[PDB]
Design a protein around this ligand. Structure first.
Ligand SMILES: OC[C@H]1O[C@@H](O[C@H]2[C@H](O[C@H]3[C@H](O[C@@H]4[C@@H](O)[C@H](O)[C@@H](CO)O[C@@H]4O)O[C@H](CO)[C@@H](O)[C@@H]3O)O[C@H](CO)[C@@H](O)[C@@H]2O)[C@H](O)[C@@H](O)[C@@H]1O
Ligand SMILES: [Mg+2]
Length: 387
């Protein structure tokens, strides 16, 4: 009797609230499950293996190609063309790219995100930076200077389990990641030099080489143990809600540049699980949640980025300092490679990064290994497409 919705993290709390109003408005009962992002990919895999799971699923954009490849998401092309709230034409092209495969559409953008630099304005001033670092050389320099405040003080965080980080920096140094032929180029100089660059922060003590176990207010607030980092909109919301002691002492900025300062485009879509016996009510739910006023309500409350383009004309999105930075960054933000093995490739990058930063492996050598692993994965997939 109940429409099952799987959602993730902090956003799923807003979705649960909205779903309560949906149930009041339509009479359709809805149970929203809240799944940590850390566990979600495994939970999705289990649902696919068992063909049992939710009716509506919040899908991280980077996993769209995987779960379309697996046949787990319903083709909703005809249905979204005929909604006035879910039509692809309303959304940013980069967001739409995460939903469309071989001419068919498999979800509706729910929110977008991109990654920006968060920095303590007061602490950067004290090391001679009146504005955020704007190049790789400046990020390195400021970070190293901030790390000299003390043995347990740092300058910049590199999250070893953040799928986007290595690949963002790689593209900034001109690596396409995969060349025109689909061949991975992780062992070519642009990428190798990127990973050397990131390792430089570990080697010089300016990025922590273990998880310090601090929440954002404890690491970025107070005396600013970690005084620069990269994140998305959800960290503006977190810091506004949890770090009052640094109100007026931090800001965001666009990413520092190397060749370019491109960031990632991510977020989440709403999709219908292929095996659902509630497809009609799933679509009603998605249409309702795509109402522009329903969207803007929760988006602005959480400082989140709409994937719907006309939302950006809203006075807050044009004039709020955080939204100005996100909007600027979004102009050039690109999805991670939209390939069905992305997550597994990212996890492989993670292992290789750990061999380097913790194991002391030579970067070129480890990138040769990693690139071979990736090529092997791609061949393994190709073979499934050639029976
Ligand atoms: O990778 C799948 C999917 O990720 C989306 O990013 C979402 C982000 O998830 C990242 C995670 O963030 C956590 C946060 O969820 C958690 O509440 C706090 C406190 O525990 O810690 C982090 O900040 O970070 C890990 C790396 O450590 C990363 O793997 C996750 O992707 O969570 C945000 C808060 O819910 C979401 O706003 C954000 O969308 C991408 O947007 C999407 O493209 C990816 O497919
Ligand atoms: Mg130090």
């Amino acid at each position: 009797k109940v429409l099952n919705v799987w959602a993730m993290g902090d956003e799923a709390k807003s979705l649960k609230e909205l779903a309560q109003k949906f149930t009041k408005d339509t009479g359709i009962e809805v149970k929203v499950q809240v799944i940590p992002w850390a566990n979600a990919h495994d939970k999705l895999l289990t649902a696919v293996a068992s063909k049992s799971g939710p009716d509506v699923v919040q899908m991280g954009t980077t996993w769209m190609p995987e779960f379309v490849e697996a046949g787990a998401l319903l083709d909703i092309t005809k249905d979204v063309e005929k909604s006035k709230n879910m039509n692809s034409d309303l959304f940013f092209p980069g967001s739409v790219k995460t939903t469309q495969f071989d001419g068919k559409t498999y979800g509706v953008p729910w929110y977008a995100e991109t990654r920006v630099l968060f920095y303590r304005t007061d602490l950067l001033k004290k090391v001679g930076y009146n504005e955020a670092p704007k190049t790789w050389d400046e990020l390195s320099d400021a970070a190293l200077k901030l790390s000299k405040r003390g043995k347990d003080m740092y300058g910049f965080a590199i999250d070893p389990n953040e799928q986007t980080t290595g690949f963002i920096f790689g593209r900034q140094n001109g690596s396409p990641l995969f060349d025109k032929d689909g061949t991975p180029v992780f062992n070519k100089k642009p990428f190798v030099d990127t990973v050397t660059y990131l390792d430089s922060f570990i080697k010089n003590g300016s990025a922590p080489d273990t998880d310090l176990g601090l929440d954002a207010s404890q690491s970025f607030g107070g005396d600013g143990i970690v005084p620069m980092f990269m994140s998305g909109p959800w960290m503006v919301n977190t810091l506004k809600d949890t770090a009052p002691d640094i109100d007026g002492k931090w800001a965001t900025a666009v990413l520092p540049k190397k060749e370019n300062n491109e960031s990632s485009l991510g977020g989440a879509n709403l999709s219908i699980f292929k095996y659902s016996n509630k497809k009609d009510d799933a679509l009603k739910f998605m249409d309702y949640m795509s109402q522009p006023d329903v969207q803007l309500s929760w988006l602005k409350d959480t400082n989140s980025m709409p994937a719907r383009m006309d939302a950006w004309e809203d006075d807050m999105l044009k004039n709020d300092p955080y939204y100005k930075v996100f909007g600027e960054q979004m102009k050039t933000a690109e999805p991670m490679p939209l390939i069905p093995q992305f997550e597994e490739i990212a996890q492989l990058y993670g292992k290789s990064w750990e061999q380097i930063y913790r194991g002391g492996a030579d970067v070129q050598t480890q990138m040769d290994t990693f690139n071979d692993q990736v090529e092997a994965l791609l061949k393994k997939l190709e073979h499934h497409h050639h029976h």
